[PDB]
Amino acid sequence: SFVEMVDNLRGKSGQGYYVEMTVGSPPQTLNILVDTGSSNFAVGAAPHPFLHRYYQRQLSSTYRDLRKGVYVPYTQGKWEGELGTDLVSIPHGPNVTVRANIAAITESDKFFINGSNWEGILGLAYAEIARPDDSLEPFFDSLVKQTHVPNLFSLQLCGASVGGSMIIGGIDHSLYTGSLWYTPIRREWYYEVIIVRVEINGQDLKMDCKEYNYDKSIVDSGTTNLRLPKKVFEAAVKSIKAASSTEKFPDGFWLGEQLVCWQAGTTPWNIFPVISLYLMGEVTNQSFRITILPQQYLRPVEDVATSQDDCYKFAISQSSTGTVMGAVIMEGFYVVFDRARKRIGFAVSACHVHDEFRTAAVEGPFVTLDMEDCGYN
Numbered sequence: 501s502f503v504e505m506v507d508n509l510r511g512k513s514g515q516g517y518y519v520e521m522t523v524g525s526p527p528q529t530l531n532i533l534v535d536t537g538s539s540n541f542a543v544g545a546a547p548h549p550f551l552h553r554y555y556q557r558q559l560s561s562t563y564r565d566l567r568k569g570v571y572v573p574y575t576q577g578k579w580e581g582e583l584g585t586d587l588v589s590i591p592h593g594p595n596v597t598v599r600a601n602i603a604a605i606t607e608s609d610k611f612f613i614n615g616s617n618w619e620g621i622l623g624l625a626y627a628e629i630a631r632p633d634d635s636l637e638p639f640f641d642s643l644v645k646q647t648h649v650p651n652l653f654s655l656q657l658c659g660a661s662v663g664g665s666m667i668i669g670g671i672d673h674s675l676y677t678g679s680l681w682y683t684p685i686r687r688e689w690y691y692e693v694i695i696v697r698v699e700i701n702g703q704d705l706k707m708d709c710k711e712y713n714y715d716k717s718i719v720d721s722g723t724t725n726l727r728l729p730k731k732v733f734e735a736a737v738k739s740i741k742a743a744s745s746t747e748k749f750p751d752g753f754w755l756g757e758q759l760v761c762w763q764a765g766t767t768p769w770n771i772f773p774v775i776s777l778y779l780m781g782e783v784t785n786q787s788f789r790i791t792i793l794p795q796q797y798l799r800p801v802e803d804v805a806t807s808q809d810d811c812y813k814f815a816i817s818q819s820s821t822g823t824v825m826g827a828v829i830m831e832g833f834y835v836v837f838d839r840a841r842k843r844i845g846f847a848v849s850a851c852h853v854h855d856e857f858r859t860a861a862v863e864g865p866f867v868t869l870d871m872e873d874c875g876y877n
């Protein structure tokens with residue numbers, strides 16, 4: 501019965517993907533951002549200049565106050581509010597209703613986005629990183645406990661405004677081609693994985709593989725960019741510069757600030773390299789790779805000028821909290837969060853990115869010795 505959930509995600513480029521939900525009795529309809537990088541379910545519950553609507557606890561006969569406060573600080577943005585429970589449904593999801601924890605947002609800073617069309621957030625990661633602590637049961641844990649929905653979901657994020665699918669409870673085989681390749685979830689907090697090798701246009705960056713996972717690597721649909729530890733980021737930017745030195749860009753382009761433009765239809769894709777991330781596999785000494793095209797890490801942005809060119813922002817940036825495989829990496833793959841078997845699956849998406857001579861791919865098997873050493877402690 502998964503066809504009912506195909507295409508249930510919408511979004512604006514650089515502003516996240518959201519699904520429609522209802523909370524309360526009688527149902528109140530809200531758009532909720534889907535975030536595999538956190539674990540709290542929270543919604544606007546007070547007026548805000550950027551909110552079109554919000555949760556009104558006073559109007560719900562099933563609302564229960566938990567009489568405890570809550571705040572969540574993300575990398576970018578933060579909010580505080582009040583904890584409670586209520587009944588929740590997903591119209592274009594399974595046909596069930598769950599009593600879930602809800603953080604009613606009363607104040608926020610740089611969290612809601614002007615004109616975004618979503619009003620809350622659905623954190624799909626594990627209780628270990630929930631606020632105020634791991635005793636606040638996350639929504640997906642409540643769903644699995646209270647219904648017969650299987651303990652897995654899958655995300656098909658389609659690039660550029662944008663759309664996609666969240667398949668809740670299973671895998672829809674019409675959304676990908678080829679084989680699924682699985683990597684272990686290293687620890688159930690973030691969706692943490694282990695990167696064992698990095699190549700750019702087929703050349704090994706030849707770093708200690710611990711650098712790739714210093715201090716962690718996560719799969720995070722709530723972050724736009726590919727974010728890399730300082731040492732890795734500097735190595736990657738240096739290589740992407742050399743491959744594209746045919747042209748020249750402001751150095752503020754490489755920092756993600758200034759955009760670059762070319763005359764419509766003449767973007768020189770062939771001078772930007774492909775990036776291959778190798779992930780730990782399911783059997784001894786085995787890995788697989790996913791390959792990212794420049795059409796994924798050069799994010800298109802509307803030209804703020806009168807000329808209608810093609811303009812892009814560089815969507816790889818530096819991190820001090822580990823690798824973040826963001827939406828720019830997830831787009832063009834079908835990603836299976838197989839919580840029951842503690843693994844994450846990748847396959848070429850049906851809505852894949854089109855280059856002229858190159859193809860995004862998921863390929864294996866590869867042999868990689870000492871993969872266990874690549875994890876940071």
Ligand SMILES: COCc1cc2cc(c1)C(=O)N[C@H]([C@H](O)CNCc1cccc(C(C)C)c1)C[C@H](C)CCCCCCCN2
Pocket residue numbers: 514515516533535537538539572573574575576577611621629720722723724725727817
């Ligand atoms: C270049 O980077 C800057 C950057 C860009 C972006 C997001 C974030 C940071 C961001 O912060 N996105 C966090 C994710 O949850 C982060 N997930 C990992 C994480 C990091 C710190 C603390 C936690 C806790 C709460 C578990 C979790 C979720 C966001 C508020 C969701 C609202 C905005 C969505 C559109 C913007 C996407 N673009």
